[PDB]
């Protein structure tokens, strides 16, 4: 990721997809720019600012920006950037750190949008577009090898403002569960476990639950020779020692007070 950094989307950037960019900001910081624009127009133009301490959002069209909105720049100059932008059919909606801060009306069409460009007092660390509009409660096949050892899912999601608990299932053909992962905000906990032929075993739920809700959150499980991995928000939150074996888990299974928006098999 070298600034200016610039992308080429490979089809429209659609209602339901979210563009996500991390990065590291300095100590001597001013400004750094995300622009999501064509080949001329700028159908969003974000620019973080540390010298004004707010963060400036416009649409350059037809040569020239339009009224400007403004939200409080929740960083400091140093210290790490997460700016996630998910476009809808009439809004994109910005969240900062993973907490929305910004809903802004589209002024020009979303479909001009092929192209993003990250520039300025940043070192960009991660850079990702995709998702969709996942329904909830959710359920699909995973490709053919599924989640198999040296594989990993890759879940972004929201558990929900007024909620209490969601789960995710990775399944077996037989509908086995290999993990059952169930953040329940009403026990301060996480339970993993697994559904052998019909019955649950024990329940693993130790461990700080790093959620919060109404904020975005990263999953990950990594498939592993021995174990699950699993990641929250960036870092090892558990393992889960396989009871079944770990090749042909074929099934994904999200329900509860979520919203997902984004799935990634990696």
């Given at each position: 990721?070298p600034?200016?950094?610039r ?5 429209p ?12 900001t ?10 999501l624009?064509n ?6 133009h ?5 010298d ?7 649409t ?5 920006f ?8 929740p960083y400091?100059?140093?210290?790490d950037?997460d700016?996630?932008i998910?476009a ?12 929305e ?16 460009s990250?520039?300025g ?20 096949g ?34 086995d569960?290999?993990?059952?992962f169930?953040?329940?905000?009403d ?9 052998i ?6 329940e ?5 639950n790093?959620?919060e ?7 990950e499980?990594?498939?592993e ?6 990641y929250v ?5 558990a ?7 770990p090749?042909?888990i074929?099934?994904?299974?999200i ?9 990634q098999?990696?």
């Amino acid at each position: 990721y070298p600034v200016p950094y610039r992308s080429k989307l490979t089809e429209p950037f659609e209602p339901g997809q979210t563009l996500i960019i991390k990065g590291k900001t300095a100590e001597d910081s001013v400004r750094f720019t995300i622009n999501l624009h064509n080949t001329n127009d700028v159908p969003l133009h974000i620019s973080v600012r540390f010298d004004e301490g707010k963060i400036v959002f416009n649409t350059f069209s037809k040569g020239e920006f339009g009224k400007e909105e403004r939200k409080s720049n929740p960083y400091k100059k140093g210290d790490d950037i997460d700016i996630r932008i998910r476009a809808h059919d009439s809004k994109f909606s910005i969240s900062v750190d993973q907490k929305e801060v910004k809903e802004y009306e589209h002024r020009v069409p979303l479909s001009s949008v092929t192209h993003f460009s990250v520039d300025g007092d940043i070192l960009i660390t991660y850079i990702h577009w995709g998702g969709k509009y996942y329904p909830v409660p959710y359920e699909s096949g995973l490709a053919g090898d599924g989640l198999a050892p040296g594989k990993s899912l890759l879940i972004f999601a929201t558990p929900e403002k007024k909620g209490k608990r969601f789960h995710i299932n990775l399944l077996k053909k037989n509908g086995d569960i290999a993990l059952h992962f169930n953040p329940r905000f009403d026990e301060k906990a996480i339970v993993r476990n697994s559904l052998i032929s019909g019955e649950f075993g024990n329940e693993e739920r130790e461990g700080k639950n790093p959620l919060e809700k109404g904020i975005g959150c990263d999953l990950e499980f990594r498939n592993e020779e021995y174990a699950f991995q699993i990641y929250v928000d960036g870092e090892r939150f558990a393992t889960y020692a396989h009871r079944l074996d770990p090749h042909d888990i074929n099934g994904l299974q999200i329900g509860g007070d979520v919203e997902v928006t984004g799935i990634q098999m990696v």
